[PDB]
Amino acid sequence: PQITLWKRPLVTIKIGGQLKEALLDTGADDTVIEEMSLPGRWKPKMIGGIGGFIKVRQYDQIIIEIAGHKAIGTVLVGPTPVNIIGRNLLTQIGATLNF
Amino acid sequence: PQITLWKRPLVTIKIGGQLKEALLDTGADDTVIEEMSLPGRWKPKMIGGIGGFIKVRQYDQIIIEIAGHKAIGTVLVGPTPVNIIGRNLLTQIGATLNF
Ligand SMILES: CC(C)CN(C[C@@H](O)[C@H](Cc1ccccc1)NC(=O)O[C@H]1CCOC1)S(=O)(=O)c1ccc(N)cc1
Ligand SMILES: [Cl-]
Ligand SMILES: [Cl-]
Ligand SMILES: [Cl-]
Ligand code: NA
């Protein structure tokens, strides 16, 4: 679709067999989701921005369906205020910002 | 333009006669720029980011150019990792997400 920016660009995602609402975020390097279980290995990471940093778990090679479009990549998991689809997965669904 | 997301969507902005680099950030409700001098009165605002809520200064009706596109709107000033062009100004310039 073409999504305007009058309101937050929220979509439904499917991750880890769960449905979640998430923000399509061109300002986020990497996808970060609220606490949930994911399979496989992980390693700790710190990410930061407005308000400072949080500690997350980095899981690689995770499949997320994003508004009906499947994509695989790294998913960070931790105490994010909002679920965020970042550039690492936006690229895979062919998302662009147009003006 | 059509901006892909393989790298950060950084553009040049012009504010206060000066060129600066800024990030086109669909996950940011608001535009926030690093400390600088802007004209007029300001009002307080709280904004939330990944690490928590912070206080910033809100300036209204500020002239700003974004990638050559003229805008006039609200600019926040405060402790910010990067200059952020958020949805208030992305909407002005006609930016949409597309996939
Ligand atoms: C600040 C940018 C440069 C980076 N962030 C993305 C931003 O879109 C961020 C997303 C968000 C929205 C609402 C609550 C919390 C976070 N919005 C944001 O702070 O909105 C403020 C600034 C003005 O308007 C309000 S991030 O969340 O720190 C981040 C960092 C690393 C990763 N991998 C993922 C996310
Ligand atoms: Cl990735
Ligand atoms: Cl591409
Ligand atoms: Cl505005
Ligand atoms: Na993995």
Write down the domain spans for chain B: 1-99
Name the experimental technique: X-ray
Contacts of B65 in chain A (CB under 8 A): none
Closest ligand to residue A59's CA: 5
Residues 6+ apart with CB under 8 A from A84: A22, A23, A25, A28, A31, A32, A33, B27
Cα–Cα distances (Å) from B45 to B56, B57, B61, B90, in that order, read 5, 6, 16, 20
Alpha-carbon radius of gyration of chain B: 13
**Cα–Cα distance measured from residue B29 to residue B35, given in angstroms and rounded to the nearest whole number:** 19
Q: Which residues pair with A97 in a beta bridge?
A: B3, B97
Closest ligand to residue B3's CA: 3
> Degrees (nearest 5) of the Cα angle A87, B21, B74?
90
User: Whose Cα sits closest to atom 21 in ligand 1?
Assistant: B28
**Cα–Cα distance measured from residue A23 to residue A11, given in angstroms and rounded to the nearest whole number:** 7
Distance from chain centroid for Cα A30: 6
For residue A82, the one-letter residue type is: V
Task: Kindly provide the resolution of this structure in angstroms, with one decimal.
Answer: 1.0
**Cα–Cα distance measured from residue B77 to residue B22, given in angstroms and rounded to the nearest whole number:** 13
Report strand pairing: A69-77 vs A84-85.
unpaired
Search chain A and give the residue with CA nearest B84: A27
CB contact under 8 A, B98 and A52: no
Structure token digits, residue B37: 């001098």
**Cα–Cα distance measured from residue B34 to residue B20, given in angstroms and rounded to the nearest whole number:** 10
Q: Does domain B1-99 have CATH number 2.40.70.10?
A: yes
- Catalogue the E-assigned strands of A17-95: 18-24, 31-33, 42-49, 52-66, 69-77, 84-85
The answer to whether residues A84 and B49 touch, using CB atoms and an 8 Å cutoff, is: no
Report strand pairing: A96-98 vs A42-49.
unpaired
Q: How many other C-beta atoms can be found within 10 angstroms of the C-beta atom of residue A49?
A: 20
Those of residues 25-84 in B touching chain A at CB distance below 8 A are: 25-29, 32, 47-54, 67, 69, 79-81, 84
